[PDB]
Design an enzyme around this catalytic site. Structure first.
Site, PDB file in Angstrom:
ATOM      1  N   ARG A  54       6.812   0.011  22.790  1.00 11.76           N
ATOM      2  CA  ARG A  54       6.728  -1.435  22.996  1.00 11.76           C
ATOM      3  C   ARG A  54       5.526  -1.694  23.860  1.00 11.76           C
ATOM      4  NH1 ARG A  54      10.257  -4.159  27.480  1.00 11.76           N
ATOM      5  NH2 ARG A  54       9.801  -6.338  27.097  1.00 11.76           N
ATOM      6  N   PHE A  59       0.730  -7.192  29.924  1.00  9.49           N
ATOM      7  CA  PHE A  59       1.979  -7.109  30.660  1.00  9.49           C
ATOM      8  C   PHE A  59       2.165  -5.631  30.936  1.00  9.49           C
ATOM      9  CE2 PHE A  59       6.776  -7.157  30.162  1.00  9.49           C
ATOM     10  CZ  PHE A  59       6.925  -7.180  31.541  1.00  9.49           C
ATOM     11  N   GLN A  62       5.441   0.410  27.356  1.00  9.58           N
ATOM     12  CA  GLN A  62       6.711   1.044  27.637  1.00  9.58           C
ATOM     13  C   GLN A  62       6.940   2.191  26.672  1.00  9.58           C
ATOM     14  OE1 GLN A  62       9.973  -1.623  27.988  1.00  9.58           O
ATOM     15  NE2 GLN A  62      11.502  -0.064  27.581  1.00  9.58           N
ATOM     16  N   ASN A 101      15.019  -0.444  32.405  1.00 10.68           N
ATOM     17  CA  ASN A 101      16.448  -0.320  32.581  1.00 10.68           C
ATOM     18  C   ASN A 101      17.131  -1.369  31.739  1.00 10.68           C
ATOM     19  OD1 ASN A 101      16.653  -2.888  34.234  1.00 10.68           O
ATOM     20  ND2 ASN A 101      15.967  -1.713  35.975  1.00 10.68           N
ATOM     21  N   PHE A 112       7.585   2.015  32.261  1.00  9.39           N
ATOM     22  CA  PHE A 112       6.548   1.171  31.705  1.00  9.39           C
ATOM     23  C   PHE A 112       5.375   1.232  32.657  1.00  9.39           C
ATOM     24  CE2 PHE A 112       7.039  -2.760  34.400  1.00  9.39           C
ATOM     25  CZ  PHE A 112       8.335  -2.661  34.893  1.00  9.39           C
ATOM     26  N   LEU A 121       9.085  -8.810  38.490  1.00 12.48           N
ATOM     27  CA  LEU A 121       9.911  -7.654  38.189  1.00 12.48           C
ATOM     28  C   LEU A 121      10.436  -7.026  39.447  1.00 12.48           C
ATOM     29  CD1 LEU A 121       7.908  -6.207  35.218  1.00 12.48           C
ATOM     30  CD2 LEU A 121       9.993  -7.426  35.212  1.00 12.48           C
ATOM     31  N   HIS A 125      13.284  -3.492  39.026  1.00 14.00           N
ATOM     32  CA  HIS A 125      12.938  -2.233  38.345  1.00 14.00           C
ATOM     33  C   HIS A 125      12.390  -1.363  39.429  1.00 14.00           C
ATOM     34  CE1 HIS A 125      13.425  -3.594  34.328  1.00 14.00           C
ATOM     35  NE2 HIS A 125      13.046  -4.761  34.791  1.00 14.00           N
TER      36      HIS A 125
END
Lengths: 164, 220, 220, 220, 220, 220
Positions: A54, A59, A62, A101, A112, A121, A125
């Protein structure tokens, strides 16, 4: 003292470059040991030959699902999932390596690499490492991803291990 | 079992007859009590799956327990094969093919292949996985050998408190239902089943009483 | 346990099966005598916490005593955390790991972390601390296993002074007290509880007489 | 209790009388039962510590239970003061000082300070903390008002299985020793105390039996 | 009362008929229990002295208690007027005059002066003083209403400990002594007046007697 | 529960105490009957999972039924997880994550997450799904609480047709079966179990006679 691991990245089998990571084992030790051990493959299973499933331009990238290869799997070296170790370190910029997660205390093996500052975030995370060498290899990877994450070519961890 | 050399590398070594003799003797003499799993884990550190199949096949008698262990290993191997399917086709030159559940068990693979798996880069811990499976099987076996249940414990009018607590903690370690349930049991069932005189001597100290004062109360 | 390996580089060597068999045999044959403490301290020289956990799990029977040992280890870890909390201070230029009550007790500390804490410079004495805790627990256990109090030791009418002083000193060694209390007790209690026939003999020698003089006096 | 407005902000609101009336009626009519804690948690959502002290002082009768709750709140307040110590030095311009263990209860602070604490930026949930403390106290109260222990349950020869399981689960929800221990109890003690005929009817289904088939077996 | 509009001025609002209906219902059905004072302080929050006079006049019957309450209000007003001088003469605009005791009682003023005094800067709360006086009067009333004293409570031979502690704590709530004397009596006379069996039980419990421990000891 | 607020923006409104009191009263008098499922669905329209948990916790007594309901909710959650897998990973900033099997039951899902899942576009029907689960559980419970089976319903010799048909249809509604089976069940059981005289009276009307004609046949 803090371990350093590398990833030799590949785009459909053509070698693309090496990203190397400093793992902050002095603040997030159990999180850093799990990424270190999965990179060496010393516990029998790991990242070598898994792909970034992904990639969202601007951004993060991942990856780490070595069991199901699509974000629904992966497992840690402590069992399938473990606690959020702590939230000392924050998402301050590109190159920060943080744990993916499925809500709190669900860390496995997905991680990521941020390619931007993602302060939203924080507190959700665990951050446990940062790119040391290779950030333009992470940046070039963005071009093979999309707004929703789907990547256009297979991007793999061709080899990985510990350097120091 | 593999052993490191002077320069740090390790290579296969023949299993010592002393290890097999000690294992068979402790199995015969100490039967199947909670203290066989630590000794089993200590005897076969770094042992190949062939060595573990040796240490299991060599156990004469108690064939029902060995069949239970074999069934448990079979179920674990099936679950491992289901959770980790093996790939087909040509294998890379720098990598050896990953083992299946029946091969993690060491039933259909040669010793040289086990040594290559254990000394690969990165190393693959087939021995540790099969040892974990055998330890789980031995836990189930020692659960089966448990003579009595935890709830049926009641001290006799003459049976001393020392023997009572010995039997209690023996069958408690043989139960192994959980850890917090064990902690709740040692608080409630331990004081709930005492002889009336020493029972009220323990109740005089309240629930805050520890085991040492619990014993020296009924002592003397 | 780790051992000095040629040349000058300590590497981890797993606990040998013969040591575990010797420990199981000494616990089987000698039960819980005062001397076991030295035998345990000598069988586990420089042992990682995992080795001491293995040696405490391999015991067969006496589960009550093992429970007191585990509880006293927990208490020592609790007090250790209380006596060694992280007070705010400037961070050290060099970082070395740190052992928690649970990191010392080998519960949540992996073998690699203990090897690090031991072989690092400066070394962290996790092994010696856990050995001190286990030795305190074993002292508690051997002082509990005392059948009779030291105050009840009395000689029989025809019981020779030999066996009397042997049993008296054995119970006194099993008993727990400061050294000065023992110095007072060996002068106030030994001569008084003797048989009158030889009690007169010991009184004729003198109050501050040594053990050998009395022993050769009542000899025969 | 605070209430949100059209613009989204919240401000203090006087406590409604038919809430106090409903609470006093449910406390007296139902006395103390496991279903008083959900009603209390639902009645005083967002209530200030003054409102909770009102709802507690307004309970006439059962003064021993209210004193137990006061003692539990007292001990809880002391623990909060011990766990976090106020920092020294200059305070940031955008931040101001926090409350103490006793002021969380609202015993020595005015209502305006509670409102400022609850609507600060960031908000401080004093009401939720004191509600958690009161819920723990009410749990201890309903534990005390339990009329039997969990082990003494034995179904009579004529008492139907429905009444037996109702009493069992009532005193089990009133026990609240743990959650996994509850899971072990509902497997063991539920099957261990049945009437012999229906007992063996339940044993015919084995331990894999669920509660529905468990009851429809003895049904009819 | 004085409801605070959401993002607006604190608009005055006449007492709803529901408040007065609940007040007359509780004062009729429950007579004068210790808890009525908390319910009275709950129903009347931020209310003008006119509201409190309306709530007091609506009470039907028990005219001796109402006369005692009015006498207590008169005494408090006399004390306030004695220890506070009252200014006179021309008063600057925008600033209300000095509130008199007979005026702070609301017997010699209208609603406008009370609303002005409860809206001035800084605020001068007349409601929180008149309610304090009414609470002192209601405390005198509930003390007078108590049928038995606290020093004369004795547990019956068959009457259990729960009913005894209920009556004891009810009478303690009705008691007039200071809080330190209250703590002294609830510490001593509770165990000093119980039945001899549970009296000896609580004596065996020793110091630091806590209510839940007492009630768990006297069980059965 | 959330409600459409002027204008067009749904905001969270906590459950009203009067609704909870109505629910407690209907679970106090009606207890468990066929009419409770419809009453429950009307009292909890558009309720967040927290409100349904509050309404299921406030029920006093009938703990076996509540345990059946909780277990069936867990079973439905497991089936939803097996049918709707949830992928792990970072969430999008605009849209919310797909709720897991336990996020529906309000166990580990905070109130804000549920409000988000309900007010988002497109909305996630968590409330209706949890209501369907609770309705399945309540159907199970009301089919269990049936005293007798539908096959056992028989009219007394002089028991009027009114009471017989009322009891028969009540037991048939409480019973659980497909409507297609009920269509044969009525035409096979209603006329057969009647009184012989009324049996012949209904058989004179015909097999496919409606309920009103069958009634007015034996009317009086």
């Amino acid at each position: 003292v803090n371990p350093t691991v590398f990833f030799d990245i590949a785009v459909d089998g053509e070698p693309l470059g090496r990203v190397s990571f400093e793992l902050f084992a002095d603040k997030v030790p159990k999180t850093a040991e799990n990424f270190r051990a999965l990179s060496t493959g010393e516990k029998g299973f790991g990242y070598k030959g898994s792909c970034f499933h992904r990639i969202i331009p601007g951004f993060m990238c991942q990856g780490g699902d070595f069991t199901r290869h699509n974000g629904t799997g992966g497992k840690s070296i402590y069992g399938e999932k473990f606690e959020d170790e702590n939230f000392i370190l924050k998402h301050t910029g590109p190159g920060i390596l943080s744990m993916a997660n499925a809500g709190p205390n669900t860390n496995g093996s997905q991680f990521f690499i941020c390619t931007a500052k993602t302060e939203w975030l924080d507190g959700k995370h665990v951050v446990f490492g940062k790119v040391k060498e290779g950030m333009n290899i992470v940046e070039a990877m963005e071009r093979f991803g999309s707004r929703n994450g789907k990547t256009s070519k297979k991007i793999t961890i061709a080899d990985c291990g510990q350097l120091e | 079992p593999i052993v490191q050399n002077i320069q740090g590398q390790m290579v296969h070594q023949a299993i010592s007859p002393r290890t097999l003799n000690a294992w068979v003797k402790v199995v015969e003499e100490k039967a199947f009590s909670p203290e066989v799993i630590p000794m089993f884990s200590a005897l076969s550190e770094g042992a190949t799956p062939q060595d573990l199949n040796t240490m299991l096949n060599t156990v004469g008698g108690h064939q029902a327990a060995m069949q239970m262990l074999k069934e448990t290993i079979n179920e674990e191997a099936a679950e491992w094969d289901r959770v980790h399917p093996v790939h087909a086709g040509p294998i890379a030159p720098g990598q050896m093919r990953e083992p299946r559940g029946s091969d993690i068990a060491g039933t259909t693979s040669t010793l040289q292949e086990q040594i290559g798996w254990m000394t690969n880069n990165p190393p693959i811990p087939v021995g540790e996985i099969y040892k974990r499976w055998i330890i789980l099987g031995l836990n189930k076996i020692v659960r089966m050998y448990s003579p009595t249940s935890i709830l049926d414990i009641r001290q006799g009018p003459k049976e001393p408190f020392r023997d009572y607590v010995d039997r209690f903690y023996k069958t408690l370690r043989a139960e192994q239902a959980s850890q917090e349930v064990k902690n709740w049991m040692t608080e409630t069932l331990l004081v709930q089943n005492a002889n009336p005189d020493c029972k009220t001597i323990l109740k005089a100290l309240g629930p805050a009483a520890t085991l040492e004062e619990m014993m020296t109360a009924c002592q003397g």
